Amino acid sequence: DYFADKHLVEEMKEQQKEQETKINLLEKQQKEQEAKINLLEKQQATIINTTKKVTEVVGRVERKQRLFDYTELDPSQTHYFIINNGNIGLAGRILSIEPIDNGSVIHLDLVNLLSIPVSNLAFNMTWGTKDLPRWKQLLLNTKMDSTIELLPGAWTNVTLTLKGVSPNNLKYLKIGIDMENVIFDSI
Amino acid sequence: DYFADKHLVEEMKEQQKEQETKINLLEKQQKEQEAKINLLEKQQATIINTTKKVTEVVGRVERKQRLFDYTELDPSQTHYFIINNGNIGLAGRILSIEPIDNGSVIHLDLVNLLSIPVSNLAFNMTWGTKKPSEAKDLPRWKQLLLNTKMDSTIELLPGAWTNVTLTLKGVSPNNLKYLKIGIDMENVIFD
Amino acid sequence: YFADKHLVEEMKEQQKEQETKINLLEKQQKEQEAKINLLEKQQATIINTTKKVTEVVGRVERKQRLFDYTELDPSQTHYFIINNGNIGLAGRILSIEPIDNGSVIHLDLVNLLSIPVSNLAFNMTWGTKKPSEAKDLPRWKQLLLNTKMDSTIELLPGAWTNVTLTLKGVSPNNLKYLKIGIDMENVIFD
């Protein structure tokens, strides 16, 4: 009763053997999983980096594409400017800004850069001061339809009435072209 | 005998201690791998989101670039159109769409928007039925599209509306709702 | 001579505990295997999407490049166009001549617009041929020469006008790269 049964210990040895095999398989599978995991990590880093690069490039391109959607300027510090939507090219020269009942009035000359006339252009305009959300809420906007005839190479007089802002506060202007009713001839 | 041998039991105990070591190692490794897997899953969710956004932006930007490559229109719902590739600017006005044997003929005027004459322009043209509104219908539609290159020795003087005829076989006027037209610049001459 | 009973009892207990631990570890191994499979598949998909995206972005970049400036090999080019989205110019190279410590490009420029433009400035970079290999680029760039040509040239609409570009540091036969762009600061429209 001080000592152990031989057969019981034999069974123990067999069990220890089976455990040995199991432990082996576990170690092996563990190495496999380690490899796969490392591979996954590195691939992920690569993806994140490449994505980073792509977003930067695409941001630059978007930024440059903005130039065809509209023209932004400070009418207090600009004489000549250009409006180009990829179809119609116009040049503008600001003659003067004058106060009129509640707001400002921009007198300017517009000129059709093309070889054929363009008529009945409409202008999308937003204006204000030189911030992000309220400065955007403090911007007024409108679409000016026109019957203006722009003959090729001819500086033509145009008046932009902008209510709500005095001349000395008028330091922001975003202007774009609406081509809904455009006719490529004399009106 | 009837009892277990001492030495054999010592051997077994030693192998058991060894097994204890290996087991402890396996547990530790299992835990760290668990942690790594967690991280990988979270990071993957983020990656899926971010990639979705990126694809979204790239799509728009690339679409915007297509406006200079060629001009797309429904000739049945269009009078004026513009072709501009960054070098040559042309305007066009559709006078009429006429039926021929198994096709349509478009009579139009083209005009050079620039200040110097351009000559020997070639036109890449693709035409057919209306552009399908669903993405799954795209490949079949593309396979059904008709294409050709119109070589013209037409000289376009600055500002002068000039008569041009596009013969498009394969599609009747009432089915002709897609026209894609671009400029080939290989043999273009400025003067 | 004989093994101790107590020691053996202890050994059986510990062996049983080992058995439980091993079972748990096998279970966890299965779970981890499944999760790893998921991760691998999703990541293959992602890698594909990313590959396509980079592919597209490349062509986009190399296209906005054409609005940014005009790149050419003046030894292989007669006619060319410069267009920054506002001003359109057409150029024809008449000759390239060697001068003191460089080359001179005689060319005709013509304003593609309907109004005259004046006081154009030109940003110019020039040098030896742009190499095909992409690894050679960062070194080839270092060796490029640059300058800004300020002008009082009046470009009337549709009128081919003589312009001379003096480019020091490179002989005519070695002048195979010219990058030219428009500076718009002092542009006057008369």
Numbering used by the authors:
A (entry chain C): 23 to 152, 159 to 215
B (entry chain A): 23 to 213
C (entry chain B): 24 to 213
The authors write:
SadB is a trimeric lipoprotein located in the inner membrane of Salmonella spp., with homologs in other enterobacteria, including pathogenic E. coli species. The sadB gene is located in an operon with sadA; orthologous operons are only found in enterobacteria, whereas other TAAs are not typically associated with lipoproteins. In this study, we determined the three-dimensional structure of SadB using x-ray crystallography and show that SadB enhances the surface display of SadA, suggesting a direct involvement of SadB in the autotransport mechanism of the trimeric autotransporter adhesin SadA. The reduced amount and increased stickiness of surface-localized SadA in the absence of SadB and the decreased resistance of SadA to proteinase K in the absence of SadB all suggest a direct influence of SadB on SadA export and folding.
To obtain the structure of SadB, a construct lacking the N-terminal signal peptide and replacing the lipid-modifiable cysteine residue Cys-22 by a serine residue was created. The resulting protein was solubly expressed in the cytosol without the lipid anchor. Crystallization trials yielded crystals diffracting to 2.45 Å. After initial attempts to solve the structure via molecular replacement with the NMR structure of YajI (2JWY) were not fruitful, we were able to solve it via single isomorphous replacement using a platinum derivative. Like SadA, SadB is a homotrimer; it is held together by an extended N-terminal coiled coil of nine heptads, which leads into three separate globular C-terminal domains of β-sandwich topology, each composed of two antiparallel β-sheets. In this variant of the Ig fold, the first sheet has the strand order β-1, β-8, β-5, and β-6, whereas the loop connecting β-5 and β-6 is especially long and includes a short α-helix protruding toward the N terminus. The second sheet has strand order β-2, β-3, β-4, and β-7. In tracing the electron density of this domain, the YajI structure was very helpful as it has the identical topology. Trimerization of the protein was not observed during protein purification, including size exclusion chromatography, suggesting a low trimerization propensity of the coiled coil. We ascribe this to the high number of polar residues in core positions of the coiled-coil domain.
